[PDB]
Amino acid sequence: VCCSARYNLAILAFFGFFIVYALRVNLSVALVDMVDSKACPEHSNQTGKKYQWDAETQGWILGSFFYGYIITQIPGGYVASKIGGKMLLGFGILGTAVLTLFTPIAADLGVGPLIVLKALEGLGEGVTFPAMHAMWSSWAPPLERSKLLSISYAGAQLGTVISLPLSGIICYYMNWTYVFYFFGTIGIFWFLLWIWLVSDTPQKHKRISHYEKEYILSSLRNQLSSQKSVPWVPILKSLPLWAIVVAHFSYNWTFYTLLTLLPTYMKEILRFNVQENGFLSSLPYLGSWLCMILSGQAADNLRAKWNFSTLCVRRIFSLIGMIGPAVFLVAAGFIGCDYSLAVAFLTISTTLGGFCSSGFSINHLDIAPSYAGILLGITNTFATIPGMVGPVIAKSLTPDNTVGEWQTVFYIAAAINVFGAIFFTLFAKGEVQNWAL
């Protein structure tokens, strides 16, 4: 029932991730109005002051977020597994939402303060995904993980879906600064709700029913660890974890391509101006969100009714969500000058990538539930490298900017995706490892 305690936590986490991603992606679409301004046959007021920022300054402003996001992944996961994930997640999203309120001031102070503000946002926000895994490690029954971790993380996709047009509408009807204030006060209200309505374990919940707490505890009974000391050497030497690391790296490289280079491909080759309606940039994330939810529910229905193994379901959904994007990404390079088919292939790739919300993205809990925060921190410290090294690759592989070099970039993305999917399918596991007991 949606009124349950675990599902209420899942809904509140959905909204938390929604708000944090809406805060993250609102700068790229509000930066256009705060700065001071041949393959296809060229298909194709405001208040406040404008800053003179070239492309390099905007790139360093936008990309400096991940340089803090990559630092507090493993420390955040460790602290979350030690003390609990509620306060870590709440205060991370609160730091993101309260630093946003100061962005109109940090901008006017200079590029230095803006880069520092984005790095502080990254530092505070890097701890939210490991904290959410370390929270579900005590809340999600083993046969309910694909549902809850899909409803929880589906906030990011709807977060972008809502942030891209709504922030533009706010910046059109009003000043550009009113984006940050609006999303910041919304994040503050969500933090006020999160502190009140959630607890980091079912035992520490003050409203949970007795039968539900007993159900959750007896389901997670035979999977929790009794070491109380993190086995770093078995974790690092475990091949089923490096399988998730390789898969997650490959998937984040492929989606960095699909969601940063492909809209740039349609601008520099198809001349499409990807939005062209405002909502065409949100449709891919919308399909991705819907597919995330539906694939989580389908994976859990499989594991519960049809008696599929956990490993078999992880393999199936990872193979789908990592070969679909690659296959539809290779074909997107052959599209010539058809902008509509390019947007269709982008949407089909981003939609089929929602299946991975029940693939490797949950396998951190299936192989080591009591240490899922540290495992997700480890797999996210590697997976945020494609988001920051990728730009160098795209800028060094397209000096002439022809269709051939873009096809080469798409081939590299697809090869990395296929290698990641095959490596995961080969070396992944779905049962709690012996070092996690």
Numbering used by the authors: 34 to 70, 81 to 87, 95 to 487
Sentences from the study reporting this entry:
Sialin, a member of the solute carrier 17 (SLC17) transporter family, is unique in its ability to transport not only sialic acid using a pH-driven mechanism, but also transport mono and diacidic neurotransmitters, such as glutamate and N-acetylaspartylglutamate (NAAG), into synaptic vesicles via a membrane potential-driven mechanism. Sialin (SLC17A5) belongs to the solute carrier 17 (SLC17) transporter subfamily that includes nine related transmembrane major facility superfamily (MFS) transporters, all of which are dedicated to anion transport, including the vesicular glutamate transporters 1-3 (VGLUT1–3) and a vesicular nucleotide transporter (VNUT). The Sialin structures in both the lumen-open and cytosol-open conformations reveal a solvent-accessible cavity, which forms the substrate translocation pathway, at the center of the interface between the N-domain and C-domain.
To capture the lumen-open state, we introduced a mutation on Arg168. This residue has a hydrophilic interaction with the carbonyl of Arg57, stabilizing TM1 which in turn presumably confines the conformation of TM7 in the cytosol-open state via a direct interaction between the hydroxyl group of Ser61 and the main chain carbonyl of Leu309. Lys168 forms a salt bridge with Glu171 and does not bind to the main chain carbonyl of Arg57. Indeed, the S61A and R168K mutations confine Sialin in the lumen-open state, indicating the importance of these residues in regulating the conformation of Sialin. Dali search shows that the overall structure of SialinR168K shares a similar fold with, VGLUT2 and monocarboxylate transporter 124 (MCT1) with R.M.S.D. values of 1.2 Å and 2.4 Å. In the lumen-open state, the cytosolic end of TM8 shifts more than 12 Å towards the N-domain around the kink at Ser332 on the lumen leaflet, and the luminal end of TM7 and TM11 shifts by over 9-Å away from the N-domain. The lumen-open structure reveals that the hydrophilic interactions between Arg195 on TM5 and Gln273 on the cytosolic helix, Ser196 on TM5 and Arg353 on TM8, Lys197 on TM5 and Asp350 on TM8 seal the substrate translocation pathway from the cytosolic space. Therefore, we employed Glide28 to dock the sialic acid into the cavity.
